[PDB]
């Protein structure tokens with residue numbers, strides 16, 4: 020990190036100050052907690068996405084999430100997971116440290132601007148599960164997996180964005196909620212990493228049919244659509260719903276049996292139907308895991324147990340830690356300073 024020369028440019032109505040190596044900066048749009056620009060990295064020859072974080076140390080919540088995102092991106096080193104090519108600040112010291120810029124691969128499209136074959140579905144879902152196995156192996160949950168954070172290149176090579184990171188944007192007929200596990204949508208319980216597997220199920224179904232699986236007009240309508248497909252919960256699951264209020268509402272609903280998935284997904288590969296049945300289980304305890312799903316017959320042509328790596332241990336003790344703004348800021352600066360680019 021032998022200090023490069025920085026230059027200034029106005030882009031997303033703020034001034035961006037970036038090393039000379041990054042040229043031809045052009046806005047892509049909004050990212051998680053900041054705006055994103057496309058650029059050409061003259062050092063590596065890669066087309067890159069550069070995210071400038073907005074007000075990264077404005078509050079404790081902002082400072083902690085800035086540290087969180089940096090920690091997450093620095094840890095992730097997997098073909099199917101967004102990772103960090105570079106991180107920089109124009110600041111020369113902790114004292115003047117105010118801005119954080121994050122750099123990753125520029126991707127061609129997301130899964131939204133791709134669909135509306137079974138072999139393509141196989142490859143796409145395989146890579147999502149491969150990436151999820153890695154993320155989950157580090158005790159990280161995505162929590163908000165959806166087509167818009169699944170980015171793909173021209174060769175259909177896929178990377179997962181925005182892992183591990185309001186009510187109004189969750190309201191109504193919105194894609195922001197359509198892929199959410201019911202237990203997290205309705206805050207039933209302390210949830211596990213198979214919330215992400217529910218999301219994969221929804222995504223896979225949509226790739227297969229060209230249609231949203233559970234296009235609910237609101238939380239309640241969406242629950243009804245879900246329960247019509249998978250059945251109303253039994254006593255066993257009801258017990259696990261620790262929210263007495265949520266549990267009480269569920270029991271008010273007329274009981275419905277699980278539907279026949281072969282009659283729902285007409286003409287689909289029987290192995291795809293089988294996998295969907297194992298992913299779209301209401302009881303999260305009983306959902307197929309990413310590692311288990313990779314071994315399912317549906318992915319026979321792609322599955323390789325020696326080419327599906329797990330992550331190094333990820334220390335997130337910081338998550339249960341209470342610190343001041345300047346403390347989170349200092350930790351973040353340390354991580355910026357210690358960054359080593361990938362080979």
Ligand SMILES: Cn1c(=O)c(Oc2ccc(F)cc2F)cc2cnc(NC3CCOCC3)nc21
Pocket residue numbers: 047048049050051055056068069070092101102103104121122123124125126127128129132170180
């Ligand atoms: C929307 N978006 C991000 O939010 C994003 O976040 C970052 C994460 C970590 C970093 F170090 C830096 C980041 F910029 C990266 C990103 C890459 N490629 C693309 N391609 C678009 C995908 C949708 O179709 C148009 C091209 N979009 C992206």
